[PDB]
C-alpha cells in the first residue's frame, strides 16, 4: 500500500515482517511497491500511536531537572501551582483503540491517579507472551 | 506488566 | 530443434491411435483443460509511480 | 457392482473447509493445571502447578503487589459489589452510587456470568478516565 | 566518538548542564517579570 | 529461509506421500486448489519448508512424485488433489519395473532419471535455503529398489553436502508380498549405503501390530499406515517450520544419529498412538509417553531392542511439553536397567522440543493429543534384521533361483555376490562396534 | 502518430494477417463490429498507429488484403474480425498465381500492382507521420513470393526513406508442402536481400516444434501457428502504441540489429510460453523469461541458433519489471554463452522495456535475433535449387511466362554471396 | 535573481525531470497544479519560488523547464499524467519521429527542424528571467535525442548566449551494462562535442546506482523511477543553496571556480549520503563524521570508477540540515589525516564546503528515509580516465570492423568525425594523465 518512507517516523514498527516475508518478496521477485520490507499497510496515525504512553514526550527534555538548585526551586515553588493544569492525552480521533462506552459524559469520579501504562496494555489479561504495542496493533486491527 | 517498587536513590549526605 | 532425429520418436511427430479425452493414453492431462486469460488490470509506470500527494505540509 | 466404485485411494478425504475439527476435545492434561480445582492450602507434597506460583520474572523481580502478600487470586476473586464500593471508597475514588452502578453495569457487560473483580473494575475505571481525558484533549488544544 | 544526551554522564555533561541551568534561570527571570513573547501574545489574544 | 524437497519413488512412495501431503495441507491450512481458506491467510509463514508461492496465492508443494507405472500417479492426477501438485513434477513412465532391480536400475531408470533430476534441479534453484532431501521410497522391488538407488547416485554426484534422508519401508521377517524382495532389498541397500545420509527403517508388520494393540482398528489397510508415517514425518520436520525450544535442523538431525559412516540405519517410532476411546481414560504426561517409546511392543520395525544396545536416541517432543519433566524422563530412562546403552556413548540423547501441537486428521483414527514424541533409535538390534535377509539371500542364491531375469536384463551376475559380501561386511561391522 | 501500413499478400499472408488484426484488436479492445469496448485510456491513446477514424467511432484497420484469387480473402472476410476491414481494401485478382514466381512477378501479378499501389498510396496519404510498411507473405508461394516482392520494390521506389519490414514465411527443412519452393524461395530472397529493411523469416516446422515441446497442444493447426506469429508481430511494434519505460521503435530496432545493410534476416521469438496445465503454476519472472527466449527451442526460425553466432539481439520486454534485473540477466546470458556471440561487438544485446503487456498476461517478451545461423536456410534452399536446376526440372512455366535462366543463375549467385557474407562473420576474429 | 533554466532532453532527461520537479514541488510546498495550499502559505521567507519557478500573475507557479524529445510518448505521458496543469503546455516540446539512437539523425536530419523552436522557447524563458545563473541540461549519453539533438542544442546555446553556466547531468554507460549497441558510437560523438562547449558535467552511472540501491537501500530489484529519485536528490542537494538559507552558501559560480582546475577537466564525481532506508535508518545516529566517511567510501561512488586508483583534485561538500561547520571541519580533518585518500600535490587545501539549513524532503512513494542530515560529494578525480578508456576500447573494437557506420554516413556526417572524436578523447586521456602526474 504505502511505503515506509511516508508513514514511518519512529524507531518502532507495529507490523514487522519478522525475517520471513522478505524471502517471499525476493523469491517472487517483487518490485519495491509490493515488497514487505519497503511497503506496509499500517498508516501514519498508527505509527504515532505505536508508543505505549498516551502522554507526550516534551521534545527536548530538561536534562538535569533534579541535580541543580534551580531544579530544586522549580520543584518546590510550582508544586502547588501545577495541579490545576491538565495533561495532553493524545487525540481522540487518532486513538482507534479505546473501547466504545456510550455515556462517557455525565459519569464522573473524583479521586484517581492516571496510570502511565496504556489501559489496553493493562487489560491484556482478558484476551486469552508479554504484551507490546505490536501485539496491540495486530489485535485491534485486521 | 504490573509496576515494581521505586529505585531508592540513597540520600547519604543531606543539606 | 533443427534436425534432431529423435523428434520423430518424441510424442510430437508420431503416428498414434488417439483415444477419447477420458482415456489415460496420451496428453489427457493437458487436453482436459483450456488456455488461460487471467485479466489482471495494468496501467503505466508514470500513472502509479508519480502520484498526487494531497496536503503534504513540508 | 453391489458396492460403489471407490478405489480406496479416495479414503484420503480430509481437506480444509470440511468437518472442521477445531473445537472437539484435547485429550491429556496440560502442564499448567488451569482446569482442575485450585488449592487454598496446597499440600506439602503434590507439586502440580495448579495455575498458582509464577514465572522466574515474578519471583526474582516481584511486583510489590506480590511483596507483603496480595497475589493474583485477590485481584480476580469474583467479589461483592458493596465490597468493591467499600474498597474503592476507602482508597478515595469518591463516586456517587449512580456512577458506581453505571460502572458496575459496564463491567458486568464486559465480564461474563456477572462476577466483576477488582482488577476488572480497575480496568474499566482506566478506560473511562482515558476516554474522559481523550475527550478533553479532543475539544481543547494542546497545553 | 559517539555523543550522548547531556543527562548521560559521559562527555561535556557538567558544563552542558551549567549552560542549560543558566538558560533556564534567564527563562524563569523573563517568566516572572513578564517579558515572554508567549505571555505577551496570550495577553494580546485575551484582551 | 528453510526448505526441503520431498521425492516420492514407487507406488508405496506415492501413496505414502499422498497421505503425507494431505496432512501437510491440513496442518498449514491450504486448500486443494492451493488457496488459503476463507481468505483468512496473523502473518503465518510456516509452510516454506514444503510450499512455494507462485503469484496468485497458489502454494504448490516441493514434491517430485516419480514412478514407472502410470497407475498410482494417474490416481493422484485424477483424484481430489489434482489442483495442488505440479503436473510436470508428477512424473511417470510407461513400463513398470515389475519388482526387478535390474530393470528399474538399468533399462527403465536411465530413460526418465534425467527428467526427474532436471525437475529436482529446478526446485533446488527455486529454493534458496535448502536443508536436504526427504526421499520416501520403499526397499520392496522394482522402482523403489533400482530407481531410488539411481536417484541417490545421480543426486550425490551433483549436490553432495546436502543431507539426503531416506525413508524406507523395510520388509517384515515373515510378512512380505514380493518373492524376489530379498534380492531387491540387498541390491538396493548395497548401492544406497554409500550415497545415503540417514536411512530410516519402517516396517509394515510392526505398524500392523501397533495398530491392533493400540487404536481400535481390527482391519488396518495401507491408508491408516500411511497416515501414521505422515505423522512420523510431520513430527520429524516440525522444527524446521515451527519455533519454540531446542530445534533440530537437517544437519543437526543427521550428524547426531550416525556414529560411523557404515551405521546410518535408524528406527522411527511415535508413541502417543492411542485413539479417542483409550485417550479419554488416561492422562498423557511426558514421563510416561517417553517410557512408552522404549517398549518392545511399541516399535515400528519388527526387531526387539532387548537383543542389542542403543547407540544414539533422538527425542522429538511436540506440543505442550516443558524441558523439565523431559530431563526427569530421560534421567529415569537412563537409570532403568533394562535399557542397555553402548559403553562408548555415555551421552546419547539428542533432544528437540517444538511448541506446535500435533494436528489431527478429520475422519481419522488418532486423537487430538496435546503431546507427541518421535523416538529415533539407533540400536544394534537391526543386525539380526539384516542377517535374516542375508539368510533369505543365501537360501535363494544357493540354487540360483530367480536370477535368469537379472541375467537377461543388462546386468552382470557377480554383483549379487558383491552385494552379499558388502552386507556380510556391514553385519560384521555391527558386531564389531556393538561390543 | 508514427503510422504503420499493413500489407498481407498470399494465402498464408492473409491468414496470418487476419489473426494479427484479431490480436491487436482485442489488445486495444475492439469488437468485430468496429467500436471500442475497452476500459483504459492507454488503449485508445495511440490507436492511430494501426487504425483510422470513422464517423460513428468505428476504427478501420490500416491494412490491405492482397491475393490473385478470391478465396482465403473471402474466408477471412466471413470469419470473425472480418467485417472490420474496409471493403475498398480488398483487392483481388482473376486467375491466381499458381504458386509461380513468374506468374506472380511478371505476367499476372503485374496487372493488379496498379490497383494495389493506388490503394496503398491512398492509405499512405491518409496518414500523418508514416513510420513504415509491414508485409506478411509466403516465400514458396506465388502471390506472396512474387507479387509481394513487386509490392516491396514499388513501395521502396515510391518511399525510399521509411521502414519497410517483411515478416515472411520461409521454407521448412523437413516436411515438403510444395515442389517449386526452391524456385519461389531463391527468386524471392534475391529481392528481399536488397529492397527490404528487415526480414523476420518465420518457419512452420519451428512453430510445430514450439507447439509440441513448449505448449503440448497435440494437434496445433494453422490457427495456433498463426497466433504465435501474430503475438510476435504485436510484440515488435509495442513501443509505438503503448507508453512506458525505455522505448524502441522499428528504426531504433533496425539500427541496433543490422550492422551491415545486407544482414537483415532475423530469427524471431515470443517467450512467455506456458503449457495448458502450467498457466497457474509458472511464476513469471524476468530470469525465466530470459531463459525461455535464449533457449534454442523457442526460435520461430527452424535454423538451430547455437550452430553459429548471435551477431545482435533484441529484448523487447513488456510489463512492470526491474531494469537492474533485466540488465543483469541479459549480461549474465552473454557471460554464460560468450561462445555464441561475436567478440567485435561489445554488448550486442539491446533491451527495451514497455509498460503494457498483452491482455490476460502480466509479463511478456519478444525476442529478435540477427544471427549467423540464418545461413543454413539459404544453404539448404540453394542445395535444393541446384538439385532442381542441374536437370532443368519444373522450369517451362517460368520460361513460358517470360523469364530467362540468367536471372535464375544470378538469384542463386546472390544467395551464395549472402551465404558467404554471413559465413565471414560466422568465425571472424578480432586481432 | 539567481534563476536557473532546466533543459531536459531525451527520454532519460524528461523522466529525471519528472522526478526532479516532483521533488521541487514537494519541498517548496507546491500542489501539482501550480497552486499553493492558500491556507498555510501565510508564512513568508524561502525565496526559492523566485529561483526555480515563476509567477503567472494570479497564483500559479510554472517552472523554468523545457522538456524536449523527438518522439511523443514519454512527453505525452507527462502531458496526461498528474503533472499536467503544472507545466506550461508548450514547453513540453515534442517532435514527430525519434532520432532512434542515431547521433547523425539527432544532429543533422531531425534536430535542424525543431532546434529553432526550442531556442525560441529558451529565448522566451530567458526574457521572462532577469538574472539567469545558467542552464541545467539533463540527458543521457546513450544516443539519439540525448546525444545528437543535445549536442547541437548546446552548440547553439553556447553560440547564442555565451558566458553562462551550462551544467550537465548526463547518464554515462556502465562498463558492462548497456541498453543499446551503437551506444559507444553515440557516447564518443557526443563527448567530442560536449568537451569544448560546456562547463561542469556530472556523469551518473546506472550500474553504480543499482549497486547503491542493492547495498544500502536494500532494493534488490530497483527501477528507473528509484534511480531518478536518487538523481533528483543529488540535483536538489546541488541547487539547495540557491533556494534555502544556509551557513555557507555555494552557488554555481563559486561551485565552478572551486571544482574546475583546468577548463577541460570539468568532470567531477557525484556521491550522496546517507542513502540508508527506513528500518535500518533510525537505529543509528547519522553523524557528520560518519556521513563524510560514507561519501569518501569508494564503494559509495555513483559512477563505477574507483577513486583509490587515482588522485583527488578538489572535493565540494554540500551539507544539508542541522549541520554545523564545527564537526564538518572535524570530519574534514579526519579525512585529511586518513592516508587512503590521496590528493594531488599542487592542491594543498582542496575542500569547498557549503552548508544549507534545509534538510532533504522525503518523497512519499520513495525509498529514502526522512533524515535530518545529508551531504553531497562532488569531488573531481583522475579516475574518470578509466571509464573514458573503457569507452575507447569498446569504440575501437566496434570501429575496427566498420560496423553500424552506414547509418551515420547515410544520415549526414561522414566517416571522419568518428576519427576526430576518438582523437579528441585520446587527447583528453593524455591531458588527464598529465594532471594526475
Ligand atoms: N507403508 C506402505 N507400504 C506399501 C504401500 N504400498 C506398497 N507398500 C510396500 O511396497 C512393497 C512393494 O513395493 P511397491 O511400492 O508395491 O512397488 P514399487 O516401489 O512401485 O516398484 P514396482 O514393483 O516396480 O512397481 C510391498 O511389499 C509393500 O509392503 C503403502 O501404501 N504403504
Ligand atoms: N538514470 C536513468 N537513466 C535512464 C532513464 N531512462 C533512460 N535512461 C538512459 O537512457 C539510455 C537509453 O537511451 P535514451 O536516453 O532512452 O535515448 P533517447 O533519449 O530516448 O533518444 P532516442 O534513442 O532517439 O529515442 C539508457 O542507457 C539509460 O541509461 C531513467 O529513467 N533514469
Ligand atoms: N503458419 C502458416 N502457414 C501457412 C498458412 N497457410 C499456408 N501456409 C504456408 O504457406 C505455404 C504455401 O504458400 P501459398 O499459400 O501457396 O502462398 P501464395 O500462393 O502467395 O498464397 C505452405 O508451405 C504453408 O505451410 C497458415 O495459416 N499459417
Ligand atoms: Mg509399484
Ligand atoms: Mg526515445
Please give the C-alpha separations between residue A95 and each of A89, A92, A133, D130, D135, in angstroms, as whole numbers. Answer: 10, 5, 13, 11, 11
> Are 3 or more Cβ–Cβ pairs between F and G shorter than 8 Å?
yes
Q: How far is F53 from chain G (nearest CA, A)?
A: 8
The 10 Å Cβ neighbour count of residue A114 is 13
3-state secondary structure of G246: coil
Active-site entry in F205, F252, F384, F415 = F252
A23 with F48: Cβ contact below 8 A: yes
The 10 Å Cβ neighbour count of residue G149 is 27
Q: What size, in residues, is chain E?
A: 47
Please give the C-alpha separations between residue F36 and each of A34, F52, F57, F60, in angstroms, as whole numbers. Answer: 19, 13, 7, 12
Q: Please list every residue in chain F whose beta carbon sits closer than 8 Å to the beta carbon of residue A137.
A: none
Q: Between helices F10-28 and F70-78, what is the axis angle to 10°?
A: 20
To test ligand 1's pocket by mutation, which of F18, F65, F138 has the most ligand atoms within 8 angstroms of CB? F138
d(CA G223, CA G227) in angstroms, rounded, equals 6
d(CA H322, CA G276) in angstroms, rounded, equals 61
Instruction: Specify the experimental method.
Output: cryo-EM
d(CA B15, CA A48) in angstroms, rounded, equals 44
3-state secondary structure of G132: strand
Cα dihedral value G369, G371, G373, G377, nearest 10: 70
Q: Whose CA is nearest to atom 22 of ligand 3?
A: G177
To test ligand 2's pocket by mutation, which of H10, H173, H203, H212 has the most ligand atoms within 8 angstroms of CB? H10
Cis peptide before G277 (omega within 30 of 0): no
Tell whether G395 lies on the interface with C, counting CB pairs under 8 A. Answer: no
Whether H294 and H285 have beta carbons less than 8 Å apart is answered as: no
d(CA H320, CA H153) in angstroms, rounded, equals 33
Cell 551544467 found at: H167
Q: What is the 3-state secondary structure (H, E, C) of chain H?
A: CCCEEEEEECHHHHHHHHHHHHHHHHHCCCCCCCCCCCCCCCCCCCCCHHHHEEECCCCCEEECEEEEECCCCHHHHHHHCCCCCCCCCCCEEECCCCCCCCHHHHHHHCHHHCHHHHHHHHHHHHHHCCCCCEEEEEEECCCHHHCHHHHHHHHHHHHHCCCCEEEEEEEECCCCCCCCCCHHHHHHHHHHHHCCCCCCEEEEEHHHHHHHHHHCCCCCCCCHHHHHHHHHHHHHHHHCCCCCCCCECCCHHHHHHHHCCCCCCCCEEEEEECCCCHHHCCCCCCCHHHHHHHHHCHHHCCCCCCCCCCCEEEEEEEEEECCCHHHHHHHHHHHHHCCCCCECCCCCCCEEEEEECCCCCCCCCCCCCCCCEEEEEEEEECCHHHHHHHHHHHHHHHHHCCCCHHHHHHCCCCCHHHHHHHHHHHHHHHHHHHHHC
Distance of CA H107 to the CA centre of its chain: 22
A63 with E25: Cβ contact below 8 A: no
Q: CA angle, G414 as apex, G412 and G418 as ends, to 5°? A: 115
Q: Is F252 a catalytic residue?
A: yes
d(CA G183, CA G403) in angstroms, rounded, equals 13
Closest in G46, G251, G431 to H100, CB measured: G251
Q: Which ligand is nearest to the CA of H110?
A: 2
3-state secondary structure of G305: coil
Active-site entry in H77, H155, H207, H254 = H254
Q: Whose CA is nearest to atom 12 of ligand 1?
A: F140
d(CA F76, CA F82) in angstroms, rounded, equals 6
G344 with H403: Cβ contact below 8 A: yes
Cα nearest neighbour of F15 on chain D: D9
Q: Is E12 exposed, middle or buried (0-12, 13-18, 19+ CB in 10 A)?
A: exposed
Q: Whose CA is nearest to atom 18 of ligand 1?
A: F10
Q: How far is A6 from chain H (nearest CA, A)?
A: 5
Mutate to test the interface with G, among A25, A28, A29, A35 (most CBs of G within 10 A): A29
Q: Is F153 exposed, middle or buried (0-12, 13-18, 19+ CB in 10 A)?
A: middle
Task: Tell whether ligand 1 has an atom less than 6 A from the beta carbon of residue F239.
Answer: no
Q: Which atom of ligand 2 is nearest to the CA of H9?
A: 19
The 10 Å Cβ neighbour count of residue H95 is 20
Whether H312 and H352 have beta carbons less than 8 Å apart is answered as: no
Cα dihedral value D71, D74, D78, D84, nearest 10: -140
Helix, strand, coil tally for chain G in percent (to 5): 45, 10, 45
Q: Where are the alpha helices (DSSP H) in B1-15?
A: none
Tell me the three cell numbers of residue D76.
480476580
d(CA H54, CA H64) in angstroms, rounded, equals 7
Cα nearest neighbour of A139 on chain F: F42
3-state secondary structure of G146: helix
Q: Whose CA is nearest to atom 12 of ligand 2?
A: H142
d(CA F58, CA F51) in angstroms, rounded, equals 9
The 10 Å Cβ neighbour count of residue F79 is 15
> Are 3 or more Cβ–Cβ pairs between H and G shorter than 8 Å?
yes
Cα dihedral value A58, A63, A66, A68, nearest 10: -130
d(CA F70, CA F14) in angstroms, rounded, equals 11
Q: What is the DSSP letter of A123?
A: T
H220 with A26: Cβ contact below 8 A: yes
C51 with H27: Cβ contact below 8 A: no
Tell me the three cell numbers of residue H181.
549497441
Task: Tell whether ligand 2 has an atom less than 6 A from the beta carbon of residue H99.
Answer: yes
Please give the C-alpha separations between residue H408 and each of H83, H100, H412, in angstroms, as whole numbers. Answer: 37, 12, 6
Cell 526427474 found at: F116
Tell whether H289 lies on the interface with E, counting CB pairs under 8 A. Answer: yes
Distance of CA D136 to the CA centre of its chain: 30
Tell me the three cell numbers of residue H18.
519528472
Beta strands in F320-410 (DSSP E): 349-354, 371-379
User: What number of C-beta contacts closer than 8 Å exist between A and D?
Assistant: 85
The 10 Å Cβ neighbour count of residue F208 is 17
Task: Tell whether ligand 1 has an atom less than 6 A from the beta carbon of residue F144.
Answer: yes
Task: Tell whether ligand 2 has an atom less than 6 A from the beta carbon of residue H228.
Answer: yes
DSSP bridge pairs for F79: none
Tell me the three cell numbers of residue H265.
577537466
Q: How far is G233 from chain F (nearest CA, A)?
A: 28
Q: What is the 3-state secondary structure (H, E, C) of F169-201?
A: EECCCCCCCCCCHHHHHHHHHHHHCCCCCEEEE
* Cα end-to-end distance, chain H, whole Å: 41
Please give the C-alpha separations between residue F297 and each of F200, F206, F282, F292, F334, in angstroms, as whole numbers. Answer: 19, 9, 19, 9, 19
> Are 3 or more Cβ–Cβ pairs between H and F shorter than 8 Å?
no
Q: How far is H282 from chain A (nearest CA, A)?
A: 5
Tell whether C55 lies on the interface with H, counting CB pairs under 8 A. Answer: yes
Q: Which ligand is nearest to the CA of F100?
A: 1
Nearest Cα neighbor of D88 from D66, D120, D62 is: D120
Cell 576474429 found at: G429
Whether G351 and G246 have beta carbons less than 8 Å apart is answered as: yes
- Between the CA of F204 and the centroid of ligand 4 the distance, in Å, is 16
Tell me the three cell numbers of residue G1.
502518430
The 10 Å Cβ neighbour count of residue D61 is 10
Distance of CA H395 to the CA centre of its chain: 24
Cell 503487456 found at: G357
Q: Which atom of ligand 1 is nearest to the CA of F69?
A: 25
Whether D130 and A54 have beta carbons less than 8 Å apart is answered as: yes
Tell whether F259 lies on the interface with C, counting CB pairs under 8 A. Answer: no
Q: How far is F300 from chain G (nearest CA, A)?
A: 38
Q: What is the DSSP letter of F306?
A: G
User: What number of C-beta contacts closer than 8 Å exist between B and D?
Assistant: 10
G136: enclosing H helix or E strand:
strand G132-136
Nearest Cα neighbor of F403 from F392, F416, F394, F390 is: F416
Tell me the three cell numbers of residue G41.
485510456
Task: Tell whether ligand 3 has an atom less than 6 A from the beta carbon of residue G147.
Answer: no
Q: Which atom of ligand 2 is nearest to the CA of H140?
A: 15
d(CA H240, CA F35) in angstroms, rounded, equals 52
**Taking the CA of residue H84 as centre, how many other CA atoms within 13 Å lie in the half-sphere pointing to its CB?**
11
Q: CA angle, D108 as apex, D104 and D111 as ends, to 5°? A: 135
Closest in G247, G259, G261 to H11, CB measured: G247
Please give the C-alpha separations between residue A57 and each of A54, A60, D100, in angstroms, as whole numbers. Answer: 10, 8, 34
CB contact set of G377 (below 8 Å; sequence gap of 6+): G170, G171, G173, G201, G301, G302, G303
Task: Tell whether ligand 2 has an atom less than 6 A from the beta carbon of residue H18.
Answer: no
The 10 Å Cβ neighbour count of residue A51 is 15
G286 with A28: Cβ contact below 8 A: no
CB contact set of F51 (below 8 Å; sequence gap of 6+): F24, F28, F30, F59, F60, F61, F62
Tell whether A29 lies on the interface with G, counting CB pairs under 8 A. Answer: yes
Query: String of b and e for F361-376 (b: at least 16 CB within 10 Å)?
Result: beebbbbbbbbbbbbb
CB contact set of F37 (below 8 Å; sequence gap of 6+): D16, D17, F29, F30, F31
Determine how β-strand F349-354 pairs with β-strand G163-166: unpaired
Cell 509440441 found at: G212
To test ligand 3's pocket by mutation, which of G11, G98, G209 has the most ligand atoms within 8 angstroms of CB? G11
Amino acid at each position: 500500500r504505502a511505503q515506509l518512507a511516508a508513514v514511518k517516523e519512529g524507531l518502532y514498527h507495529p507490523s514487522l515482517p519478522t525475517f520471513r516475508r522478505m524471502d517471499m518478496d525476493t523469491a517472487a521477485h517483487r518490485l519495491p511497491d509490493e515488497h514487505c520490507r519497503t511497503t506496509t499497510g499500517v498508516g501514519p496515525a498508527d505509527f504515532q500511536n505505536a508508543t505505549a504512553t498516551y502522554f507526550q514526550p516534551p521534545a527536548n527534555t530538561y536534562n538535569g531537572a533534579n541535580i541543580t538548585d534551580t531544579g530544586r526551586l522549580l520543584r518546590e515553588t510550582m508544586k502547588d501551582d501545577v495541579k490545576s493544569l491538565r495533561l495532553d492525552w493524545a487525540k481522540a480521533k487518532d486513538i482507534k483503540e479505546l473501547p466504545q462506552i456510550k455515556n462517557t459524559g455525565q459519569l464522573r469520579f473524583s479521586g484517581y491517579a492516571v496510570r502511565y501504562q496504556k489501559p489496553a496494555i493493562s487489560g491484556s489479561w482478558r484476551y486469552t507472551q508479554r504484551p507490546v504495542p505490536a501485539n496491540i496493533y495486530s489485535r485491534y486491527r485486521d | 506488566i504490573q509496576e515494581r517498587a521505586r529505585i531508592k536513590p540513597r540520600q547519604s549526605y543531606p543539606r | 530443434a533443427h534436425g534432431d532425429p529423435q523428434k520423430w520418436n518424441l510424442p510430437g511427430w508420431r503416428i498414434e491411435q488417439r483415444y477419447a479425452g477420458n482415456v489415460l493414453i496420451g496428453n489427457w492431462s493437458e487436453e482436459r483443460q483450456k488456455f488461460g486469460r487471467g485479466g489482471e488490470k495494468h496501467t503505466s509506470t508514470h500513472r502509479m509511480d508519480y502520484l498526487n500527494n494531497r496536503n503534504f505540509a513540508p | 457392482a453391489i458396492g460403489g466404485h471407490r478405489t480406496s485411494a479416495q479414503m484420503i478425504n480430509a481437506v480444509v473447509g470440511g468437518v472442521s475439527t477445531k473445537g472437539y476435545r484435547t485429550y491429556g492434561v496440560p502442564t499448567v493445571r488451569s482446569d482442575i480445582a485450585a488449592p487454598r492450602t496446597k499440600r506439602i507434597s503434590d507439586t502440580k502447578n495448579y495455575g498458582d506460583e509464577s514465572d522466574a520474572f515474578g519471583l526474582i523481580n516481584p511486583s510489590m503487589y506480590s511483596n507483603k502478600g496480595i497475589y493474583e487470586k485477590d485481584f480476580f476473586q469474583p467479589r461483592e459489589p458493596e465490597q468493591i464500593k467499600g474498597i474503592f471508597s476507602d482508597i478515595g475514588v469518591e463516586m456517587d452510587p449512580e456512577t458506581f452502578h453505571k460502572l458496575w453495569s459496564v463491567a458486568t457487560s464486559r465480564s461474563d456470568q456477572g462476577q466483576v473483580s477488582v482488577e476488572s473494575f480497575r480496568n474499566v475505571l482506566d478506560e473511562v478516565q482515558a476516554l474522559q481525558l481523550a475527550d478533553e484533549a479532543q475539544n481543547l488544544g494542546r497545553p | 566518538v559517539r555523543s550522548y544526551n547531556p543527562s548521560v554522564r559521559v562527555g561535556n555533561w557538567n558544563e552542558d548542564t551549567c549552560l542549560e541551568e543558566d538558560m533556564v534561570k534567564d527563562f524563569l527571570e523573563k517568566k516572572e517579570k513578564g517579558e515572554l513573547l508567549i505571555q505577551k501574545a496570550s495577553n494580546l489574544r485575551s484582551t | 529461509m528453510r526448505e526441503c524437497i520431498s521425492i516420492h519413488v514407487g507406488q508405496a512412495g506415492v501413496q505414502i506421500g499422498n497421505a503425507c501431503w494431505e496432512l501437510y495441507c491440513l496442518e498449514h491450512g491450504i486448500q486443494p486448489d492451493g488457496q488459503m481458506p476463507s481468505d483468512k491467510t496473523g502473518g503465518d509463514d510456516s509452510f516454506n519448508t514444503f510450499f512455494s508461492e507462485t503469484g496468485a496465492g497458489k502454494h504448490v508443494p516441493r514434491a517430485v512424485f516419480v514412478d514407472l507405472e502410470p497407475t498410482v500417479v494417474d490416481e493422484v492426477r485424477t483424484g481430489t488433489y489434482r489442483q495442488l501438485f505440479h503436473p510436470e513434477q508428477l512424473i511417470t513412465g510407461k513400463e513398470d519395473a515389475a519388482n526387478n532391480y535390474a530393470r528399474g536400475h538399468y533399462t527403465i531408470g536411465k530413460e526418465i532419471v534425467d527428467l526427474v533430476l532436471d525437475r529436482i534441479r529446478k526446485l533446488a534453484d527455486q529454493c534458496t535455503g535448502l536443508q536436504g532431501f526427504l526421499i520416501f521410497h520403499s526397499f520392496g522391488g522394482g522402482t523403489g529398489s533400482g530407481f531410488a538407488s539411481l536417484l541417490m547416485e545421480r543426486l550425490s554426484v551433483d549436490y553432495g553436502k546436502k543431507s539426503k534422508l531416506e525413508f524406507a519401508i523395510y520388509p517384515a521377517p515373515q510378512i512380505s508380498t514380493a518373492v524376489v524382495e530379498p534380492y531387491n532389498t540387498i541390491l538396493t541397500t548395497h548401492t544406497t549405503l554409500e550415497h545415503s545420509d540417514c536411512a530410516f527403517m519402517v516396517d509394515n508388520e510392526a505398524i500392523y501390530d501397533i495398530c491392533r494393540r493400540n487404536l481400535d482398528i481390527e482391519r488396518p489397510t495401507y491408508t491408516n499406515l500411511n497416515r501414521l508415517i505422515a505423522q512420523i514425518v510431520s513430527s520429524i520436520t516440525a522444527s524446521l517450520r515451527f519455533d519454540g525450544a531446542l530445534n533440530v535442523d537437517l544437519t543437526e538431525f543427521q550428524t547426531n544419529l550416525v556414529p560411523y559412516p557404515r551405521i546410518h540405519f535408524p528406527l522411527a517410532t511415535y508413541a502417543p498412538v492411542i485413539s479417542a476411546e483409550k485417550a479419554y481414560h488416561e492422562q498423557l504426561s511426558v514421563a510416561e509417553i517417553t517410557n512408552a517409546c522404549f517398549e518392545p511392543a511399541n516399535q515400528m520395525v519388527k526387531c526387539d531392542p532387548r537383543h542389542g544396545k542403543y547407540m544414539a536416541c533422538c527425542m522429538l517432543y511436540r506440543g505442550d511439553v516443558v524441558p523439565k519433566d523431559v530431563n526427569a524422563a530421560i534421567a529415569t530412562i537412563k537409570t532403568k536397567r533394562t535399557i542397555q546403552f553402548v559403553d562408548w556413548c555415555p551421552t546419547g540423547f539428542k533432544v528437540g522440543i517444538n511448541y506446535q501441537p500435533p494436528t489431527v486428521v478429520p475422519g481419522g483414527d488418532l486423537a487430538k493429543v496435546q503431546r507427541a514424541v518421535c523416538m529415533l533409535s539407533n540400536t544394534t538390534a537391526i543386525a539380526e534384521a539384516w542377517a535374516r535377509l542375508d539368510h533369505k539371500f543365501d537360501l535363494m542364491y544357493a540354487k540360483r533361483a530367480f536370477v535368469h531375469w537379472y541375467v537377461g536384463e543388462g546386468m552382470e551376475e557377480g554383483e549379487f555376490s558383491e552385494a552379499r559380501e558388502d552386507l556380510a561386511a556391514l553385519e560384521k561391522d555391527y558386531e564389531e562396534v556393538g561390543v | 502518430m508514427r503510422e504503420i501500413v499493413h500489407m498481407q499478400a498470399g494465402q498464408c499472408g492473409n491468414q496470418i494477417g487476419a489473426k494479427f488484426w484479431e490480436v491487436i484488436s482485442d489488445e486495444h479492445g475492439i469488437d468485430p463490429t468496429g467500436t471500442y469496448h475497452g476500459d483504459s485510456d492507454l488503449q485508445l491513446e495511440r490507436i492511430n498507429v494501426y487504425y483510422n477514424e470513422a464517423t460513428g467511432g468505428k476504427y478501420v484497420p490500416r491494412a490491405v488484403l492482397v491475393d490473385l484469387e478470391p478465396g482465403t480473402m473471402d474466408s477471412v472476410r466471413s470469419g470473425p474480425f472480418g467485417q472490420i476491414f474496409r471493403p475498398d481494401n480488398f483487392v483481388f485478382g482473376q486467375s491466381g498465381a499458381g504458386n509461380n514466381w513468374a506468374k506472380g512477378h511478371y505476367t499476372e501479378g503485374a496487372e493488379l500492382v496498379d490497383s494495389v499501389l493506388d490503394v496503398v498510396r491512398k492509405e499512405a496519404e491518409s496518414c500523418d507521420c508514416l513510420q513504415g510498411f509491414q508485409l506478411t507473405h509466403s516465400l514458396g508461394g506465388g502471390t506472396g513470393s512474387g507479387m509481394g516482392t513487386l509490392l516491396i520494390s514499388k513501395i521502396r521506389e515510391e518511399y525510399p526513406d521509411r521502414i519497410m519490414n517483411t515478416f515472411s514465411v520461409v521454407p521448412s527443412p523437413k516436411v515438403s508442402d510444395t515442389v517449386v519452393e526452391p524456385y519461389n524461395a531463391t527468386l524471392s530472397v534475391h529481392q528481399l536481400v536488397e529492397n527490404t529493411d528487415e526480414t523476420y523469416c518465420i518457419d512452420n516446422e519451428a512453430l510445430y516444434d514450439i507447439c509440441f515441446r513448449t505448449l503440448k497442444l497435440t494437434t496445433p493447426t494453422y490457427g495456433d501457428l498463426n497466433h504465435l506469429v501474430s503475438a510476435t508481430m504485436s510484440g515488435v511494434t509495442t513501443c509505438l502504441r503503448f507508453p512506458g519505460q525505455l522505448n524502441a521503435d522499428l528504426r531504433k530496432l533496425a539500427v541496433n540489429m543490422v550492422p551491415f545493410p545486407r544482414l537483415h534476416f532475423f530469427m524471431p521469438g515470443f517467450a512467455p510460453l506456458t503449457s495448458r496445465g502450467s498457466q497457474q503454476y509458472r511464476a513469471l519472472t524476468v530470469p525465466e523469461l530470459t531463459q525461455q527466449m535464449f533457449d534454442a527451442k523457442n526460435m520461430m526460425a527452424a535454423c538451430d541458433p547455437r550452430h553459429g553466432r548471435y551477431l545482435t539481439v533484441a529484448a523487447i520486454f513488456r510489463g512492470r519489471m526491474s531494469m537492474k534485473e533485466v540488465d543483469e540477466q541479459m549480461l549474465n546470458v552473454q557471460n554464460k554463452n560468450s561462445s555464441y556471440f561475436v567478440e567485435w561487438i561489445p554488448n550486442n544485446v539491446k533491451t527495451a522495456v514497455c509498460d503494457i503487456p498483452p491482455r490476460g498476461l502480466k509479463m511478456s517478451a519478444t525476442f529478435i535475433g540477427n544471427s549467423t545461423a540464418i545461413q543454413e536456410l539459404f544453404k539448404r534452399i540453394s542445395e535444393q535449387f541446384t538439385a532442381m536446376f542441374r536437370r532443368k526440372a519444373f522450369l517451362h512455366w517460368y520460361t513460358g511466362e517470360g523469364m530467362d535462366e540468367m536471372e535464375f543463375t544470378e538469384a542463386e549467385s546472390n544467395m551464395n554471396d549472402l551465404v558467404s557474407e554471413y559465413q565471414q562473420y560466422q568465425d571472424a576474429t578480432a586481432e
